[PDB]
Amino acid sequence: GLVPRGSQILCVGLVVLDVISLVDKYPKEDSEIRCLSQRWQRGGNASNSCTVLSLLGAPCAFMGSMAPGHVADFLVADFRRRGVDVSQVAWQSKGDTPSSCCIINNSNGNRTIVLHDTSLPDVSATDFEKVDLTQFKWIHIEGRNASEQVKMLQRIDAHNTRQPPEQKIRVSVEVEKPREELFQLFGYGDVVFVSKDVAKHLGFQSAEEALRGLYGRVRKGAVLVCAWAEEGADALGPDGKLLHSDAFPPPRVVDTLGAGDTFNASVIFSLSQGRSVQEALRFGCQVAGKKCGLQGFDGIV
Amino acid sequence: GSQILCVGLVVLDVISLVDKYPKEDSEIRCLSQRWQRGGNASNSCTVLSLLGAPCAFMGSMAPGHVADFLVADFRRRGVDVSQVAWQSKGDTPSSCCIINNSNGNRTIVLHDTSLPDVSATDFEKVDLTQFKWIHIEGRNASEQVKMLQRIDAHNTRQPPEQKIRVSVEVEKPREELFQLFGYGDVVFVSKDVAKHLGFQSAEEALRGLYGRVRKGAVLVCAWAEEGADALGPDGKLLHSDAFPPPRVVDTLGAGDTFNASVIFSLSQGRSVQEALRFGCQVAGKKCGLQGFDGIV
Ligand SMILES: CSc1ccccc1Nc1nc(N2CCNCC2)nc2c(NCC3CC3)ncnc12
Ligand SMILES: CSc1ccccc1Nc1nc(N2CCNCC2)nc2c(NCC3CC3)ncnc12
């Protein structure tokens, strides 16, 4: 259906079906056991952020690869259950829609993960060419297939050239896997999220070290953003002033899975509403902190 | 009386193909993934169908998109699903199946979902005429024993040349099920069961457990790569070597395949030696393939 010009926030990245089984002890190879409970959840960074953005009350759309099938079906249903617009999906002829198996050992809370396979093509720069962008006021890109996504980022730059400052599509990027490839993305977007895990691999030991040490890699004018779990989150702009917000511990911690996806979407959301980096950064921490005391996303409102 | 009927579970098998089994805490990416209509009695129907034997599945199913997939599968295969006992309470079971591509080991985490078992009542209303053979997967023992007695009774009304042959699997090591030995013309006891009860080989098992079977019954017990053995009224232990493929790559449903093929062979007149032998033959072939397609 009809979508008003410049109203949606689009996230581009992975969606995946996580099957999650809770067990007494970890199963010895070649045995048949029962779990205590089993959940089917929709996963993925770009995917979760959409779930959150919807709850926060923004129109939003997901772009990611799916292949027709029963996994795609459950995945699409959940998306829609969360108010997420699914019309930009790049359906594939080749490969499996991603699906991971996770086994949580109940007595010691360990997680053993069999990761979705690699068969499905990522969204391509030509997949992306075909998208009428007028729809969006903000595009956010989970870093995955970098050479391609660079072309999409350049495409968005083009578009903006011609639009007055109030009809420009804001852009953000997330680099959350320690993979040399992705590091180029640092040079794109108005907002750049770098993850504690990436920063530790590059050798930094605190969000301030990360921001101060990586700011040079970002494009001029850009805000670089780093969250450190319970240590809060920082951010650094062109003004060179290091911004910070402490965490907001919940009553008790229950589910931190997807917390960073929540921090991301919330920061994005707050900025798109015209708030300040300092304000977006705080909000980001508040929503993500609430999430951690909750199971899933339902509570977070 | 032309169909064969299997009575047990149907289950979504959510399969991950892994090149080695992961350890606790580890995070290893899988090679491929597929969805697959599982459940012991469900698998046997698949296997029977492929062998060209008209057959029927009977079990519980909760309506939903899961069931919608399981069903299309049965049909693409010619499995009479009309005896199915639909629920409206609980959801379709499903399990995670890690199949290790370097030894065909299959590790299963099953999500059992309450979903009522098919009951002697559900069974009380089945037209026993259309079935030459009935196979029951050990599950709800007490409720099934009624189902079993229903057949015997029906047998004692028909000519020896019109009876319904009955087979019975006892796969999981649960006390409730050991009463199921006393029924059926053929009884399958798994290696897993055999060990748990103190036995080191299938030959030993067969000797130990023959006490517990009906008079005139054949006790069957496979032992993986070791082959499979049988035991009849005659007192003579029968054996058959395995037919290992050169690359064992997926054993999920091997045993369900062994049982189907043994039943099939027996229902076609062939001897126990011959059906035992055929059972290993087809199961072995299966372990060389992903899934079931192409075991013929
Ligand atoms: C700064 S918000 C954020 C951003 C990205 C990921 C996670 C978070 N938030 C939090 N993560 C964790 N993490 C906990 C451990 N693993 C990483 C995340 N703990 C807390 C917390 N209390 C923490 C107590 C120790 C558990 N209070 C508020 N926010 C977060
Ligand atoms: C007697 S056939 C049979 C009946 C019921 C279950 C399984 C089977 N057959 C086989 N099962 C297993 N397994 C089932 C139990 N878990 C381990 C493997 N491995 C093999 C195998 N393995 C490779 C050869 C020795 C080197 N070769 C032939 N048949 C079977």
Nearest CA to ligand 2 atom 11: B224
Kindly determine whether residue B96 and residue A21, on different chains, have CB atoms separated by under 8 Å. Answer: yes
This structure was determined by X-ray
Report the run of H or E that residue B224 belongs to, with start and end: none
What six digits make up the tokens of A110?
């360990």
- How crowded is residue A135: how many other Cβ atoms within 10 Å of its Cβ? 20
Phi, psi of B277 (to 5 degrees): -60, -45
Instruction: In whole angstroms, give the CA distance from residue A193 to residue A44.
Output: 16
Residue of B213, B217, B191 whose CA lies nearest to B202 = B191
User: How would you classify residue A267: left for phi > 0, otherwise alpha for psi between -120 and 50, otherwise beta?
Assistant: alpha
Alpha helices by DSSP H, chain B: 40-51, 65-76, 120-124, 141-155, 191-196, 202-209, 254-267, 272-286
Taking residue A285's Cβ as centre, other Cβ atoms within 10 Å add up to 21
Among candidate residues A236, A224, A225, A286, the one with its CA nearest the CA of residue A259: A286
How many other CB atoms are there within 10 angstroms of residue B236's CB atom?
10
Pairwise CA distance, residues A119 & A97, whole Å = 8
Q: Nearest residue of B to residue A111 by CA position?
A: B25
Contact B222, B255 (CB under 8 A): yes
Q: What is the CA radius of gyration of chain B?
A: 18
> How deeply is A266 buried, as exposed, middle or buried, from its count of CB atoms within 10 A (0-12, 13-18, 19+)?
buried
Q: Among all chains, which residue has been given the structure tokens 């702009």? A: A237
CA atoms of A31 and B225, how far apart (whole Å): 16
Helix (H) / strand (E) containing B197: none
Burial of A130 (0-12, 13-18, 19+ CB in 10 A): exposed
Residue nearest to atom 15 of ligand 2 (CA): B224
Cα of B90 vs its chain's centroid, Å:
24
Q: What is the DSSP letter of B91?
A: -
Residues 6+ apart with CB under 8 A from B240: B227, B228, B229, B273, B276, B277, B279, B280
Q: How far apart are CA A246 and CA A230, in angstroms?
A: 8
Q: Which residues of B are annotated as a binding site for ATP?
A: 106, 224-227, 253-256
Q: Is B148 in the pocket of ligand 2 (CB under 6 A)?
A: no
Q: In 3D, which of A111, A78, A156 has the Cα closest to residue B23?
A: A111
A41: nearest Cα among A63, A22, A64: A22
In order of A50, B93, B234, the CA distances from A226 in angstroms are 20, 42, 78
What token pair was written down for A142?
A: 């989970």
Report the residue among B287, B292, B295 best suited for mutation to probe ligand 2: largest number of ligand atoms under 8 A from its CB: B287
Beta bridge partners of B32: B17
User: Closest Cα partner for B192 from B261, B254, B99, B114?
Assistant: B254
Question: Is B109 within 8 Å of A74 when comparing Cβ atoms?
Answer: no
The DSSP element (H or E) to which B92 belongs, if any, is none
State the nearest Cα–Cα gap between A35 and chain B, in angstroms: 6
What is the rounded CA–CA span in Å between residue A273 and residue A150? 26
How far, in Å, CA of B7 to CA of A37, rounded?
26
Pocket test for ligand 2, best of B240, B241, B251 (most atoms within 8 A of CB): B251
Q: Which of A20, A32, A75 would best serve as a mutation to test chain B binding (most B beta carbons within 10 A)?
A: A32
Alpha-carbon gap, residue A102 to A41, rounded angstroms: 11
Kindly determine whether residue B18 and residue A114, on different chains, have CB atoms separated by under 8 Å.
yes
Own/partner long-range contacts of A240-247 (Cβ < 8 Å, ≥24 apart): A242/A208, A242/A211, A242/A212, A243/A277, A243/A278, A243/A281, A244/A207, A244/A281, A245/A278, A245/A281, A245/A282, A245/A284, A245/A285, A246/A285, A247/A285, A247/A289
- Residue A128, C-beta contacts closer than 8 angstroms, at least 6 positions apart: A12, A63, A148, A151, A152, A155
Kindly identify the ligand whose nearest atom is closest to the C-alpha of B240: 2
DSSP state of A85: B
Interface residues from chain B to A (CB-CB < 8 Å): 14, 16, 18, 21-35, 65, 69, 94, 96, 98, 100, 105-112, 172
Closest Cβ opposite residue B29 in set A31, A38, A115: A115
- The Cα B156–Cα B128 span in angstroms is 13
Find out whether B131 and B147 touch, Cβ atoms under 8 Å. no
Half-sphere exposure of B72 (CA within 13 A, CB side): 8
| Shortest Cα distance, chain B CAs vs residue A261, angstroms | 20
Chain B positions touching A25 (Cβ under 8 A) are: none
Kindly list the residues from chain B whose CB atom is less than 8 angstroms away from the CB atom of residue A109: none
B17: closest CA among B96, B99, B95, B94? B99
DSSP one-letter code for B111: E
Query: How far apart are alpha carbons A128 and B14 in whole angstroms?
Result: 32
Rounded Cα gap, residues B160 and A111, in angstroms: 58
Question: Phi and psi at residue A210, in whole multiples of 5°?
Answer: -55, -55
Q: How many domains does chain A fold into?
A: 1
Task: Say what angle helices B272-286 and B254-267 make with each other, to 10 degrees.
Answer: 150
Nearest Cα to Cα of residue B43 among B159, B137, B120:
B137
Write down the H helix ranges in chain A. Answer: 45-56, 70-81, 125-129, 146-161, 196-201, 207-214, 259-272, 277-292
Strand B186-189 relative to strand B165-170: parallel, antiparallel, unpaired? parallel
Phi and psi (nearest 5°) for B140?
A: -90, 85
Atom of ligand 2 nearest to the CA of B104: 18
- Provide the 10 A C-beta neighbour count for residue A290: 18
Give the C-alpha separation, B212 to A7, whole Å: 73
Q: List the CATH number of the domain containing B266.
A: 3.40.1190.20
B5 strand-pairing partners: B56, B134
Alpha carbon nearest to ligand 1 atom 5, residue: A260
Contact flag B110-A35 (C-beta cutoff 8 Å): yes
How far apart CA B80 and CA B131 sit, in angstroms, is: 12
Name the residue facing A114 among B24, B30, B110 (closest C-beta).
B30
- The closest residue, in CA terms, to atom 15 on ligand 1 is A229
In this structure, the number of other CB atoms found within 10 A of the CB of residue A252 comes to 7
Which strands, in side-by-side order, build the sheet including B79-80? B79-80, B55-58, B3-7, B131-137, B165-170, B186-189, B218-222, B228-231, B237-240
CA angle B88/B75/B222 to nearest 5° reads 90
Distance CA B194, CA B192 (A): 5
Q: How far apart are CA B164 and CA B30, in angstroms?
A: 45
CA distances to A160, A171, A193, A256 from A163, in Å: 5, 14, 25, 40
Q: Which residues of A96-113 are buried (b: 16+ CB within 10 A; e: fewer)?
A: bbbbbbbbbbeeeeeebb
Residue that the structure tokens 């409102």 belong to: A301
Residue list, annotated binding site of B: 13, 39-40, 43, 106, 224-227, 253-256
Ligand with an atom nearest the CA of residue B275: 2
**Which range marks the domain in which residue B152 is found?**
1-296
Amino acid code (one letter) for B266: L
Torsion, Cα B234 B162 B178 B190, to 10 degrees, reads 70
CA atoms of B57 and B293, how far apart (whole Å): 19
What's the half-sphere exposure (Cβ side, CA atoms, 13 Å) at A285?
A: 23
Q: Where are the beta strands (DSSP E) in chain A?
A: 8-12, 16-23, 32-34, 37-43, 60-63, 65-66, 90-91, 99-105, 111-115, 136-142, 170-175, 191-195, 223-227, 233-236, 242-245
Enumerate the β-bridge partners of residue B189.
Answer: B170
